[PDB]
Specification:
Layout (H helix, E strand, L loop, with lengths): L31 E4 L2 H8 L8 E5 L2 E3 L11 H4 L6 H8 L1 H4 L7 H17 E3 L4 E5 L5 E3 L2 E4 L2 E6 L2 E3 L7 E3 L7 E3 L5 E4 L2 E6 L2 E3 L10 E2 L2 E2 L7 E4 L3 E6 L2 E7 L2 E2 L14 E4 L2 E7 L3 E2 L3 E5 L2 E3 L13 E3 L4 E5 L2 E3 L9 E3 L7 E3 L1 E3 L2 E3 L1 H4 L22 H8 L7
Parallel strand pairs: 1-2, 2-5, 3-6, 4-7, 5-8, 6-9, 7-12, 8-13, 9-14, 12-17, 13-18, 14-19, 18-21, 19-22, 20-23, 21-24, 22-25, 23-26, 24-27, 25-28, 26-29, 27-30, 28-31
Antiparallel strand pairs: 10-11, 15-16, 31-32
Bound molecules: calcium ion and chloride ion.
Chloride ion (CL) binds next to loops.
Subunit structure: Monomer.
Main location: secreted
Enzyme class: lyase
């Protein structure tokens, strides 16, 4: 079968559980589309509830920050008339506002601004849909695909620069607060039976180094790359290339969302994380099989310094096998970061800078996650992960 008709293999990760991931492989020819701009993409997707099996070929670069005439949109097009960045910053400055949640005129104007952008950049992917890039240069620039539905395949696309013109200030987030943006390249928001394969994820022509600091914190225009929340389940992400980005992959959005318990069943294999700062993945609650992934970076880079790979969040059940981390100088313990409620990590065959480590034991964790993955393809020895992943992960390594 050609790319548009390929499905997830019957043993290939949590995505293959139960009914599996067939996407739009059963489509008739009247639901096979080739799209090259936002309008064509939106028309082909139809409404949230268009469950008819469909295949969507992306040809060229689809910029999502565009009006209905495909004219480019920026800050001043999206801005609410009351919003003014200068005024937002003077309102919420910790030396006059303190650490209370922003409220009043500029936060309200900011929220409405963000909604205006969201209506353009965020697109929902309905059930039984395969979206695949044609050739080696299929790109989505500015867009956030949201998948709330079952049975979706996304492959062979370079996603770039899911950029938010209206980051929110949150002074309660850590000890000096943070800026947060809304847009991922892909957000699996309660979606199920999803395969994300041979995609590339990066920050395009607007890396975080071109963002200023406000209140001493990076004015962050980006959020995740491939995130999962709100009971998302049964997902395989394979052979993708994440690079030159801060927050990569967050699975479970809140310690209060204990309905994520027994869900967030996700398999990550043969992905490349190069110059990724953090969260690769950060997990709450999920049974997440992480195997044969390659992580490379520098703790002293000036653009995207490595901080950690795996975030051991509340009641997380990461089962990690034969993953390879090349970050010179990094202490074994600091391959991971443990958050409140994070108590367990199983990891075997972890290589850090050529040396076999036990990340779980280096942090005093339990290695009992209470499950063992049965559904996986063959597991590579750790010694071959770097080559297989460098040579095979990412968009345009099929067409
Ligand atoms: Ca996100
Ligand atoms: Cl988080």
């Amino acid at each position: 079968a050609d790319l548009g008709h390929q499905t997830l293999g019957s043993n290939d990760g949590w995505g293959a559980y139960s009914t599996g991931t067939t996407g739009g492989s059963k489509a008739s020819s009247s639901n096979v589309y080739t799209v090259s701009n936002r309008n064509q993409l939106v028309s082909a997707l139809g409404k949230e509830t268009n469950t008819t099996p469909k295949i969507i070929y992306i040809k060229g670069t689809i910029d999502m920050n565009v009006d209905d005439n495909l004219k480019p949109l920026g800050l001043n097009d999206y801005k609410d008339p009351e919003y003014d960045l200068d005024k937002y910053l003077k309102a919420y400055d910790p030396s006059t506002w303190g650490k209370k949640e922003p409220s009043g005129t500029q936060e309200e104007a900011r929220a409405r601004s963000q909604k205006n952008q969201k209506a353009r950049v965020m697109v929902d992917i309905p059930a039984n849909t395969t979206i695949v890039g044609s050739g080696t240069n299929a790109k989505v620039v500015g867009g956030n695909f949201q998948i709330k539905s079952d049975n979706v395949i996304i492959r062979n696309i370079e996603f770039q620069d899911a950029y938010d013109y209206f980051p929110q200030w949150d002074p309660t987030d850590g000890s000096s607060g943070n800026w947060n943006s809304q847009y991922d390249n892909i957000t699996i928001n309660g979606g199920t039976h999803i395969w994300i394969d041979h995609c590339t994820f990066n920050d395009g022509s607007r890396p975080d180094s071109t963002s200023p600091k406000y209140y001493g914190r990076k004015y962050q225009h980006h959020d995740g790359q491939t995130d999962a929340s709100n009971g998302a389940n049964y997902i395989t992400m394979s052979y993708n290339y994440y690079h030159d980005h801060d927050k990569s992959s967050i699975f479970g959005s809140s310690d209060s969302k204990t309905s994520d318990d027994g869900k967030l069943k996700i398999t990550l294999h043969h992905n490349r994380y190069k110059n990724i700062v953090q969260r690769a993945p950060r997990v709450r609650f999920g049974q997440v099989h992480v195997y044969n992934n390659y992580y490379e970076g520098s703790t002293s880079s000036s653009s995207y310094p490595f901080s950690y790979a795996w975030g051991i969040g509340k009641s997380s059940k990461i089962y990690a096998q034969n993953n390879v981390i090349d970050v010179p100088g990094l202490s074994a313990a600091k391959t991971i970061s443990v958050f409140s409620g994070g108590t367990a990590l199983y990891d075997s065959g972890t290589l850090l800078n050529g040396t076999q480590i036990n990340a779980s034991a280096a942090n005093g964790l339990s290695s009992s996650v209470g499950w063992t993955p049965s559904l996986h393809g063959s597991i590579d020895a750790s010694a071959n992960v770097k080559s297989n992943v460098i040579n095979q992960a990412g968009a345009g390594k099929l067409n």
